[PDB]
Amino acid sequence: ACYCRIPACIAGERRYGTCIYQGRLWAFCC
Secondary structure, eight states, X not given: OOOOOOSSSXXXXXXXXXXXBTTBOOOXXX
């Protein structure tokens, strides 16, 4: 399962779609 976009190990994969929730997008983090 993928989490949201947070200043973390965002590398590896980059999600194109963005999640609008409280102003926080979801990057591909695993």
